[PDB]
Coordinates of all heavy atoms in Angstrom, one line a residue:
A348 N -76.4 -7.3 -4.7 CA -77.5 -6.3 -4.8 C -77.1 -4.9 -4.4 O -77.4 -3.9 -5.0 CB -78.7 -6.8 -4.0
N349 N -76.5 -4.8 -3.2 CA -76.2 -3.5 -2.7 C -75.3 -2.8 -3.7 O -75.5 -1.6 -3.9 CB -75.5 -3.7 -1.3 CG -75.3 -2.3 -0.7 OD1 -76.3 -1.6 -0.5 ND2 -74.0 -2.0 -0.3
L350 N -74.3 -3.5 -4.3 CA -73.4 -2.8 -5.2 C -74.1 -2.5 -6.5 O -73.9 -1.4 -7.1 CB -72.2 -3.8 -5.5 CG -71.3 -4.0 -4.3 CD1 -70.2 -5.0 -4.6 CD2 -70.7 -2.6 -3.9
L351 N -75.0 -3.3 -7.1 CA -75.8 -3.0 -8.2 C -76.5 -1.7 -8.1 O -76.6 -0.9 -9.0 CB -76.8 -4.1 -8.6 CG -76.2 -5.4 -9.2 CD1 -77.2 -6.5 -9.2 CD2 -75.7 -5.2 -10.6
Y352 N -77.0 -1.4 -6.9 CA -77.8 -0.3 -6.6 C -77.0 0.9 -6.1 O -77.5 2.0 -5.7 CB -79.0 -0.7 -5.6 CG -80.1 -1.4 -6.3 CD1 -79.9 -2.7 -6.7 CD2 -81.2 -0.7 -6.7 CE1 -80.9 -3.4 -7.4 CE2 -82.2 -1.4 -7.4 CZ -82.1 -2.7 -7.8 OH -83.0 -3.4 -8.5
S353 N -75.7 0.8 -6.1 CA -74.8 1.9 -5.8 C -74.8 2.8 -7.1 O -75.0 2.3 -8.2 CB -73.4 1.5 -5.5 OG -72.7 1.0 -6.6
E354 N -74.5 4.1 -6.9 CA -74.4 5.0 -8.1 C -73.4 4.5 -9.1 O -73.7 4.5 -10.3 CB -74.1 6.4 -7.6 CG -74.0 7.4 -8.7 CD -73.8 8.8 -8.1 OE1 -74.3 9.1 -7.0 OE2 -73.1 9.6 -8.8
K355 N -72.2 4.0 -8.6 CA -71.2 3.5 -9.4 C -71.7 2.4 -10.4 O -71.4 2.5 -11.7 CB -70.1 2.8 -8.5 CG -68.9 2.2 -9.3 CD -67.9 1.5 -8.3 CE -67.2 2.5 -7.4 NZ -66.2 1.8 -6.5
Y356 N -72.5 1.5 -10.0 CA -72.9 0.4 -10.9 C -74.3 0.6 -11.5 O -74.5 0.1 -12.6 CB -72.8 -1.0 -10.2 CG -71.4 -1.3 -10.0 CD1 -70.8 -1.3 -8.7 CD2 -70.6 -1.6 -11.0 CE1 -69.4 -1.6 -8.5 CE2 -69.2 -1.9 -10.9 CZ -68.6 -1.9 -9.6 OH -67.3 -2.1 -9.5
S357 N -75.1 1.4 -10.9 CA -76.4 1.8 -11.5 C -76.1 2.6 -12.8 O -76.7 2.3 -13.8 CB -77.3 2.5 -10.5 OG -77.8 1.6 -9.5
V358 N -75.2 3.6 -12.7 CA -75.0 4.4 -13.8 C -74.3 3.6 -14.9 O -74.6 3.7 -16.1 CB -74.1 5.7 -13.5 CG1 -73.7 6.4 -14.7 CG2 -75.0 6.6 -12.6
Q359 N -73.3 2.7 -14.6 CA -72.6 1.9 -15.6 C -73.5 0.9 -16.2 O -73.4 0.6 -17.4 CB -71.4 1.3 -15.0 CG -70.3 2.4 -14.7 CD -69.0 1.7 -14.3 OE1 -68.1 1.5 -15.1 NE2 -68.9 1.4 -13.0
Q360 N -74.4 0.3 -15.4 CA -75.4 -0.6 -16.1 C -76.2 0.1 -17.1 O -76.5 -0.4 -18.2 CB -76.3 -1.3 -15.1 CG -75.8 -2.3 -14.1 CD -76.9 -2.7 -13.2 OE1 -77.8 -3.4 -13.5 NE2 -76.8 -2.1 -12.0
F361 N -76.7 1.3 -16.7 CA -77.7 2.0 -17.5 C -77.0 2.6 -18.8 O -77.6 2.5 -19.9 CB -78.3 3.1 -16.7 CG -79.5 3.8 -17.3 CD1 -80.6 3.2 -17.8 CD2 -79.4 5.2 -17.4 CE1 -81.6 3.9 -18.5 CE2 -80.4 6.0 -18.0 CZ -81.5 5.3 -18.6
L362 N -75.8 3.1 -18.7 CA -75.1 3.8 -19.7 C -73.8 3.2 -20.2 O -73.2 3.7 -21.1 CB -74.7 5.3 -19.2 CG -75.9 6.1 -18.7 CD1 -75.5 7.4 -18.2 CD2 -76.9 6.3 -19.9
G363 N -73.5 2.0 -19.6 CA -72.2 1.3 -20.0 C -71.1 1.8 -19.1 O -71.1 2.7 -18.3
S364 N -70.0 1.1 -19.3 CA -68.8 1.3 -18.4 C -68.2 2.7 -18.5 O -68.2 3.3 -19.6 CB -67.7 0.3 -18.8 OG -68.2 -1.1 -18.8
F365 N -67.8 3.2 -17.4 CA -67.0 4.5 -17.4 C -65.9 4.4 -18.4 O -65.1 3.4 -18.4 CB -66.5 4.8 -16.0 CG -67.6 5.1 -15.0 CD1 -67.6 4.6 -13.8 CD2 -68.7 5.9 -15.4 CE1 -68.5 4.8 -12.8 CE2 -69.7 6.2 -14.5 CZ -69.6 5.6 -13.2
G366 N -65.7 5.5 -19.2 CA -64.6 5.5 -20.2 C -65.0 4.9 -21.5 O -64.2 5.0 -22.5
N367 N -66.1 4.2 -21.6 CA -66.5 3.6 -22.9 C -67.5 4.6 -23.5 O -67.0 5.4 -24.4 CB -67.1 2.2 -22.7 CG -67.5 1.5 -24.0 OD1 -67.7 2.2 -25.0 ND2 -67.5 0.2 -23.9
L368 N -68.7 4.6 -23.1 CA -69.7 5.6 -23.6 C -69.9 6.7 -22.6 O -70.5 7.7 -23.0 CB -71.1 4.9 -23.8 CG -71.1 3.7 -24.6 CD1 -72.6 3.2 -24.7 CD2 -70.5 4.0 -26.0
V369 N -69.5 6.7 -21.4 CA -69.9 7.6 -20.4 C -68.7 8.1 -19.6 O -67.9 7.2 -19.2 CB -71.1 7.1 -19.4 CG1 -70.6 5.8 -18.7 CG2 -71.5 8.1 -18.4
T370 N -68.6 9.4 -19.3 CA -67.6 10.0 -18.5 C -68.1 10.4 -17.2 O -69.2 11.0 -17.1 CB -67.0 11.2 -19.2 OG1 -66.4 10.8 -20.5 CG2 -66.0 11.9 -18.4
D371 N -67.4 10.0 -16.1 CA -67.7 10.4 -14.7 C -67.0 11.8 -14.6 O -65.8 11.9 -14.5 CB -67.2 9.4 -13.7 CG -67.4 9.8 -12.3 OD1 -68.0 10.9 -12.0 OD2 -67.1 9.0 -11.4
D372 N -67.8 12.8 -14.6 CA -67.3 14.2 -14.5 C -67.1 14.7 -13.1 O -66.6 15.8 -12.9 CB -68.3 15.2 -15.2 CG -68.6 14.8 -16.6 OD1 -67.6 14.6 -17.4 OD2 -69.8 14.7 -17.0
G373 N -67.4 13.9 -12.1 CA -67.5 14.3 -10.7 C -68.8 15.0 -10.4 O -69.6 15.4 -11.3

Side-chain angles (χ1 to χ4, degrees):
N349 189 52
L350 293 174
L351 285 166
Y352 284 75
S353 73
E354 183 177 324
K355 179 182 294 185
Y356 292 107
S357 288
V358 172
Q359 290 187 97
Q360 291 175 73
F361 184 59
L362 302 175
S364 303
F365 292 138
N367 184 336
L368 306 183
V369 59
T370 294
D371 180 355
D372 303 311

